Amino acid sequence: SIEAEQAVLGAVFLDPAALVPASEILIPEDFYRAAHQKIFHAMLRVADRGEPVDLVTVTAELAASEQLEEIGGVSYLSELADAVPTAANVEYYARIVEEKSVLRRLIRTATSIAQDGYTREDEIDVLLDEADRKIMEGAFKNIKDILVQTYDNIEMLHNITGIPTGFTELDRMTSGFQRSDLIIVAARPSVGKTAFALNIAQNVATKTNENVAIFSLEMSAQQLVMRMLCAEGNINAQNLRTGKLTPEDWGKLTMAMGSLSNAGIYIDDTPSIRVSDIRAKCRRLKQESGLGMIVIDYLQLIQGSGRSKENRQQEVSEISRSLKALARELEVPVIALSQLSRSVEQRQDKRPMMSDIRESGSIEQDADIVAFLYRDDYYNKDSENKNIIEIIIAKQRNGPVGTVQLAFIKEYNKFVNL
Amino acid sequence: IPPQSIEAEQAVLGAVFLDPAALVPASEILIPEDFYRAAHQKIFHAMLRVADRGEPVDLVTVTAELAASEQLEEIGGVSYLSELADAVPTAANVEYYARIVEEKSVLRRLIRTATSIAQDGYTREDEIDVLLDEADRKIMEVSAFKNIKDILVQTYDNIEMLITGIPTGFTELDRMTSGFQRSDLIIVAARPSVGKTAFALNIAQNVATKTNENVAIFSLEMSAQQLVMRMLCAEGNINAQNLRTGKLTPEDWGKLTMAMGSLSNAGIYIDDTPSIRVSDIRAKCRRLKQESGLGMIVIDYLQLIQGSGRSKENRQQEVSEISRSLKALARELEVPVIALSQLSRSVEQRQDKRPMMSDIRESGSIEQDADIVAFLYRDDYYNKDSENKNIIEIIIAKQRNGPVGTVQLAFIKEYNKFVNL
Amino acid sequence: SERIPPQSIEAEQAVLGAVFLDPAALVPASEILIPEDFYRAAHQKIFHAMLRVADRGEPVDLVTVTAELAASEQLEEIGGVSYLSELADAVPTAANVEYYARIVEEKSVLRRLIRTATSIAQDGYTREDEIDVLLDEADRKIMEVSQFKNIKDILVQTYITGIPTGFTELDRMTSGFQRSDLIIVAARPSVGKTAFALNIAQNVATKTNENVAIFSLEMSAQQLVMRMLCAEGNINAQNLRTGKLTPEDWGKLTMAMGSLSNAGIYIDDTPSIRVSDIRAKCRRLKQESGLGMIVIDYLQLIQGSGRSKENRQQEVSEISRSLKALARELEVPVIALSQLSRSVEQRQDKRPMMSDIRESGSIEQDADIVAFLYRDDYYNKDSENKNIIEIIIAKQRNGPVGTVQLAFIKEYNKFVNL
Amino acid sequence: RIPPQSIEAEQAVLGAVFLDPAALVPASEILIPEDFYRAAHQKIFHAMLRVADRGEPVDLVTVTAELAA
DNA sequence: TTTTTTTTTTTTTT
Numbered sequence A: 001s002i003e004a005e006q007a008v009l010g011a012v013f014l015d016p017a018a019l020v021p022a023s024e025i026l027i028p029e030d031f032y033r034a035a036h037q038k039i040f041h042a043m044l045r046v047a048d049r050g051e052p053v054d055l056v057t058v059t060a061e062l063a064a065s066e067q068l069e070e071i072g073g074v075s076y077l078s079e080l081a082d083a084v085p086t087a088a089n090v091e092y093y094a095r096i097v098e099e100k101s102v103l104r105r106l107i108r109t110a111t112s113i114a115q116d117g118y119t120r121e122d123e124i125d126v127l128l129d130e131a132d133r134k135i136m137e138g139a140f141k142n143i144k145d146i147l148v149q150t151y152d153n154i155e156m157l158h159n160i161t162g163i164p165t166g167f168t169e170l171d172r173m174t175s176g177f178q179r180s181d182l183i184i185v186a187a188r189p190s191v192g193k194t195a196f197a198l199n200i201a202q203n204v205a206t207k208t209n210e211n212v213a214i215f216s217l218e219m220s221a222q223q224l225v226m227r228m229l230c231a232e233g234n235i236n237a238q239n240l241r242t243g244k245l246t247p248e249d250w251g252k253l254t255m256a257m258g259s260l261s262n263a264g265i266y267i268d269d270t271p272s273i274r275v276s277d278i279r280a281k282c283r284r285l286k287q288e289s290g291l292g293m294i295v296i297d298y299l300q301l302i303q304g305s306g307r308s309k310e311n312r313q314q315e316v317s318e319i320s321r322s323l324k325a326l327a328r329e330l331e332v333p334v335i336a337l338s339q340l341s342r343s344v345e346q347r348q349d350k351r352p353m354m355s356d357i358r359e360s361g362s363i364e365q366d367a368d369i370v371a372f373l374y375r376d377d378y379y380n381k382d383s384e385n386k387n388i389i390e391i392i393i394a395k396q397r398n399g400p401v402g403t404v405q406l407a408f409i410k411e412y413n414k415f416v417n418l
Numbered sequence B: 001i002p003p004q005s006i007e008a009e010q011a012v013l014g015a016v017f018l019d020p021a022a023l024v025p026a027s028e029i030l031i032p033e034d035f036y037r038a039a040h041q042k043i044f045h046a047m048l049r050v051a052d053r054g055e056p057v058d059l060v061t062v063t064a065e066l067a068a069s070e071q072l073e074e075i076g077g078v079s080y081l082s083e084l085a086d087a088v089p090t091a092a093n094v095e096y097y098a099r100i101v102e103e104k105s106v107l108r109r110l111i112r113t114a115t116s117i118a119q120d121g122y123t124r125e126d127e128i129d130v131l132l133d134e135a136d137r138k139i140m141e142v143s144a145f146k147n148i149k150d151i152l153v154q155t156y157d158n159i160e161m162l163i164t165g166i167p168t169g170f171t172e173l174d175r176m177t178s179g180f181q182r183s184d185l186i187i188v189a190a191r192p193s194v195g196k197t198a199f200a201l202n203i204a205q206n207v208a209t210k211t212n213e214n215v216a217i218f219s220l221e222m223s224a225q226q227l228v229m230r231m232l233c234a235e236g237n238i239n240a241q242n243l244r245t246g247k248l249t250p251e252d253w254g255k256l257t258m259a260m261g262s263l264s265n266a267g268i269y270i271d272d273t274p275s276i277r278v279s280d281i282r283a284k285c286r287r288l289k290q291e292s293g294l295g296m297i298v299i300d301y302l303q304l305i306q307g308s309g310r311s312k313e314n315r316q317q318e319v320s321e322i323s324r325s326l327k328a329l330a331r332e333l334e335v336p337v338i339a340l341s342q343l344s345r346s347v348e349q350r351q352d353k354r355p356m357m358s359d360i361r362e363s364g365s366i367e368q369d370a371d372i373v374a375f376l377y378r379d380d381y382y383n384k385d386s387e388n389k390n391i392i393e394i395i396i397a398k399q400r401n402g403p404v405g406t407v408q409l410a411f412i413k414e415y416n417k418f419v420n421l
Numbered sequence C: 001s002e003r004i005p006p007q008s009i010e011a012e013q014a015v016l017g018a019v020f021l022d023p024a025a026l027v028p029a030s031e032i033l034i035p036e037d038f039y040r041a042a043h044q045k046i047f048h049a050m051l052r053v054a055d056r057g058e059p060v061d062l063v064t065v066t067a068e069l070a071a072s073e074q075l076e077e078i079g080g081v082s083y084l085s086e087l088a089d090a091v092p093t094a095a096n097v098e099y100y101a102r103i104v105e106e107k108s109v110l111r112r113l114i115r116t117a118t119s120i121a122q123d124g125y126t127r128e129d130e131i132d133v134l135l136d137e138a139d140r141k142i143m144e145v146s147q148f149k150n151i152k153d154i155l156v157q158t159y160i161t162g163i164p165t166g167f168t169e170l171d172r173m174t175s176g177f178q179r180s181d182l183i184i185v186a187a188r189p190s191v192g193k194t195a196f197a198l199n200i201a202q203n204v205a206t207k208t209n210e211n212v213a214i215f216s217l218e219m220s221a222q223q224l225v226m227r228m229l230c231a232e233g234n235i236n237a238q239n240l241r242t243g244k245l246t247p248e249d250w251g252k253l254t255m256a257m258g259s260l261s262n263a264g265i266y267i268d269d270t271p272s273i274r275v276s277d278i279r280a281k282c283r284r285l286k287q288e289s290g291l292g293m294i295v296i297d298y299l300q301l302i303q304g305s306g307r308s309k310e311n312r313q314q315e316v317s318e319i320s321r322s323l324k325a326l327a328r329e330l331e332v333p334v335i336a337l338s339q340l341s342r343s344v345e346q347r348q349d350k351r352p353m354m355s356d357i358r359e360s361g362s363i364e365q366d367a368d369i370v371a372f373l374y375r376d377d378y379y380n381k382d383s384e385n386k387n388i389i390e391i392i393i394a395k396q397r398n399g400p401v402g403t404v405q406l407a408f409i410k411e412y413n414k415f416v417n418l
Numbered sequence D: 001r002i003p004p005q006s007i008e009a010e011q012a013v014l015g016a017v018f019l020d021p022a023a024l025v026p027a028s029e030i031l032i033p034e035d036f037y038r039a040a041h042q043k044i045f046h047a048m049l050r051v052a053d054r055g056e057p058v059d060l061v062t063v064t065a066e067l068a069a
Numbered sequence E: 001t002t003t004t005t006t007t008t009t010t011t012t013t014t
């Protein structure tokens, strides 16, 4: 019942534009306390002039009828003022007062049905109709309303929609890397999964102004940064990891480090996290700096929430769910790297299909987009055109399916446009 | 002073000791609990207990039965059973008095459920909507074998009626099916990104816009905003890529302006809460039917629905249960329910990748429960080069209305649209 | 504590009775029983005399039998002629001696088992001498509680007991549909389970005079009756569905309705019942009208008695027990429809085996008889000989196992003989 | 043999929530209800989070409404 | 106990 009542009346003496929502939601009778009934009435009575509604005009109106003394003094009206947490959410106190009102209305009509049960033992069918009728006395989104928001959204379309990867052909096909999408990038071992993900992270963090979080469960932060340096500056990786650098390499490195500093890429290399942990960390980074992308080096390495070490297919089924839900909650694209089962290798056409994604089919199902990497030179030692690598876009429910081509200069840990 | 024709109660019991073929109407009309007097309750029970042997029912066998339990002394003596015999002269219109006893029974049942509603009003101040629902539901509940003579009549009168059928607007499918029938569970299953939602959305539109019926859509994967954008594209033939960029041609805006027009008076109710239980779905639909009337329910994706508490059970059982609940919902609301389903990868392993019933993902009970199972298959989903691209099979693997078979449609993907051929 | 050697000397009397009533009933009786099978010393002697007189053959009536009993010292030992007179009045008809003889025989086997088991335990303490040969005797002595055609038997020379289903070939193999049997009809989804059950129900309810109760947990009564109408009159279901009936179809329907009225088939379509509920309802219908068959539209759809939501395999294990016991109590065949697990669709041969019965192995084990339905055209779109359907009788402890063929004209919801 | 606890500090957390209540964000990033020692605080901080998931949001009124619920 | 989905070593399918 009470106290929420006081919070409503209180907010009115505080605002008083708060009377509008209050009265849309409540009539004086909804209040339980006799006194509040009278006060809220007076408030509306003064609003009809309209005065408007403050601690003075209200007591003037309550004295204008015999009522000012009946409701406690001016001193009770004064207490009401001092008795609300925040003027802003009257809506939520009003709705308590309203819900309590409905409860006793229910109780009252139910008791009067029982009451009538003993009396009008005369005509059973019309009594059961009355009971039906006496007890009756949207949670769906309406389409009219959505159409407007969907229109106004298409409107905001002067000037990729889209966090841009910097790979022209993929961006044309995809237009980002959209907020709330789960993007799966899967391919056989040592084909280029991480390399590809890191390259995307760089071009996002350096070319745009957005922050990107990378969770690396297999490699160290060190190794990651060293891959980005090489790619940023075209420094040969073998040289870099030996310290055997040419005089111009030292130049390239100096530049690479420069641009990667103002880059804002946050790396977490804890080898065992649950999705909950990931969520927590991202939630906090977005809190204080804003987030744009999340990259995860590698979905089946993530570890389960307690359900006991369940049918492993279910365990990852669940991780899959959690990731999509995380992308949805943070309104941010989530790129999850995935492995593939050996099935693909048994074939002639070594290009992967969705079925191939390792460990659980739910991953195909949950993803907003599924990208495979295929390299002819991964299988052919002699292969004509070496550095070419297919980005097979096997799934997307934005739009088009298809294959895109890039060059993967491995010596530089780098993917490039053609 | 509870409602009781303790005069009429005696008249019934009396007639049984007098006839006793009079026990047949009596029991068709009453159960022991309908009697107000504790004693009569016990006697009428004994009467039926003896009838189940059957003895049959006279003043002797009844007292033998009452003594066989601790009860003969509790109900008055043999001398009370003797009075019951003499209370009414003849045993003809028992039907009369039985119906008084019954009517009084209903009255106190009503009073009792009304008082317990009021009672609960003060206690469970926790969840208002599910409480008000109980009152609604508890008051209706104050309303053995169906005889075939009677059904035959209703059925003849029903056949006297002449798509039967909520029409999908896909001619060949509608010929095979004739709607989309009230109370049916329709499963639409197919591999990922094949066209499940697309198909279901297309059906929802053609129902909501071509007919006058309301349709509820529960989307657990996509947002309402994405759903409507699919329908817009399909309604007006606007290329989806253009639409999501805002990169619209001058005639595209024309197409969009009309699409929006027709979809307004469409009356399609969308709920995109990503986790619901079937109970929740039921509740929402019940209410929408209440005040506006419902025609169809569409659920994007059955295995995404979540279980009622039974603990995180053998997952196969958990969906087994969801399956039943859905059919039972379709049954209760007298409305076709279209549940989208995923498929296990088993089909992928096969030579020809047209699905069979076994392929439905996660629990075999879905094949079983369904009134009708529809698979979608696309040659161009597997062949990059495939001859005749836009063709898509609607394999009707199951229906207990009638015929099984395959139907062909075109799925112009650029327009999020299925079309007739 | 008090251990009473198992016997039914009601059923004993019913057998001897039927012989004085028929007496062609002595043929089944003796195929099933030897004199020693009877528990009561007196019956032993009587049934012996009956066979003694049949070997002349006299044949066997109340006179000749007393003549034979007096011919030995025995007529006074077995009660008087007055006891032989009571045996006659035991049963209304010499209908189904086969039934009661098989009870007497089954009880006989039980005590033979008990007796050999106790004598094995007995010998366990005594002959502590030769362990391995004691185990051989035990093996062998337990088999001998059970009692390969010879070449001569096979030279009879070159060149219904029973509620009748109306399917000749099935009835030959089965002879009803026997009182107290649990008959399991299982098959994959949409194969023909319900259709087949309904067809049986009609032919029983219309051709015979017996009442049949059908519990439908999946389909409405309305849909059931519409299936029967189509099958009774050969009206195309689609036409009937739509109301799009030809002028002669109306004739066919008018007929079908006629005969189905005096049919007496009681339908209960409550979607959730416990077996107790089923029992209750049937007990009452038998009370006032008599019952012949119970059909249940599906066993795993029935719901459990409180034991908490137990290991589901046990829950149905229990339902299974309850049903057999209900069939036993009401002395009436119970046809329970069952689903099958998907494991059959793995096999290159899709004919079910007992193992395939879905959810609990106890069903194989409780059933008196297990029937599978198999359709080639269910799997082959093009299949040669379409409307053919195998009725695989995989289990029956009456007698013969084997397959029977029928046609299942689906357009007519109808099974037909060939 | 008296369990490490700091009720003063527990109260100070719950207090700050009723005062701010954007203070619930840091609080829940750091704590779950079970971290609190006093049975009562456990329940209160739970309710606070329970109301935040709607989100109401969290003040002295809505909290007592949830606790009475 | 059972039903379901996954990966990966064997044999034998004209």
Ligand SMILES: Nc1nc2c(ncn2[C@@H]2O[C@H](COP(=O)(O)OP(=O)(O)O)[C@@H](O)[C@H]2O)c(=O)[nH]1
Binding pocket: A187, A188, A189, A190, A191, A192, A193, A194, A195, A196, A236, A237, A238, A410, A411, A413
């Ligand atoms: N030739 C050469 N190749 C390299 C060097 N460093 C990395 N790579 C190549 O880049 C690939 C890295 O693959 P990666 O993305 O880490 O594998 P994934 O995460 O499983 O997809 C490896 O297969 C290497 O062949 C280098 O110094 N020289």
Ligand SMILES: Nc1nc2c(ncn2[C@@H]2O[C@H](COP(=O)(O)OP(=O)(O)O)[C@@H](O)[C@H]2O)c(=O)[nH]1
Binding pocket: A395, A396, A397, A398, A399, A400, A401, B190, B191, B192, B193, B194, B195, B196, B197, B198, B199, B239, B240, B241, B413, B414
């Ligand atoms: N070519 C093309 N296809 C599209 C476009 N937008 C959506 N689609 C396709 O439509 C399909 C969506 O299928 P959907 O029903 O959502 O997947 P399901 O629910 O798992 O069956 C996918 O195959 C997409 O590639 C587009 O702009 N162009």
Ligand SMILES: Nc1nc2c(ncn2[C@@H]2O[C@H](COP(=O)(O)OP(=O)(O)O)[C@@H](O)[C@H]2O)c(=O)[nH]1
Binding pocket: B399, B400, B401, B402, B403, B404, C187, C188, C189, C190, C191, C192, C193, C194, C195, C196, C236, C237, C238, C410, C411, C412
């Ligand atoms: N051609 C045709 N076939 C039908 C028609 N009605 C039903 N059927 C088929 O007959 C069968 C009857 O369903 P049923 O097998 O009893 O369900 P069950 O309990 O799973 O076995 C189904 O296989 C339907 O396809 C009809 O009107 N026309």
Ligand code: ALF
Binding pocket: A188, A189, A190, A193, A194, A218, A298
């Ligand atoms: F070898 Al990897 F992701 F680094 F498969």
Ligand code: ALF
Binding pocket: A364, A365, A366, A397, B191, B192, B193, B194, B196, B197, B221, B301
């Ligand atoms: F693309 Al899906 F369920 F596989 F919407």
Ligand code: ALF
Binding pocket: B367, B368, B400, C188, C189, C190, C191, C193, C218, C298
């Ligand atoms: F299709 Al069914 F029991 F109705 F297998």
Ligand SMILES: [Ca+2]
Binding pocket: A193, A194, A195, A218, A297
């Ligand atoms: Ca990697």
Ligand SMILES: [Ca+2]
Binding pocket: B196, B197, B221, B300
């Ligand atoms: Ca979908």
Ligand SMILES: [Ca+2]
Binding pocket: B397, B398, B399, B400, B403, B404, C190
């Ligand atoms: Ca079928």
Ligand SMILES: [Ca+2]
Binding pocket: C193, C194, C218, C297
């Ligand atoms: Ca069935």
Ligand SMILES: [Ca+2]
Binding pocket: C317, C321, C362
């Ligand atoms: Ca058992």
Ligand SMILES: [Ca+2]
Binding pocket: C355, C356
């Ligand atoms: Ca098995």
Ligand SMILES: [Ca+2]
Binding pocket: C368, C397
């Ligand atoms: Ca038996």
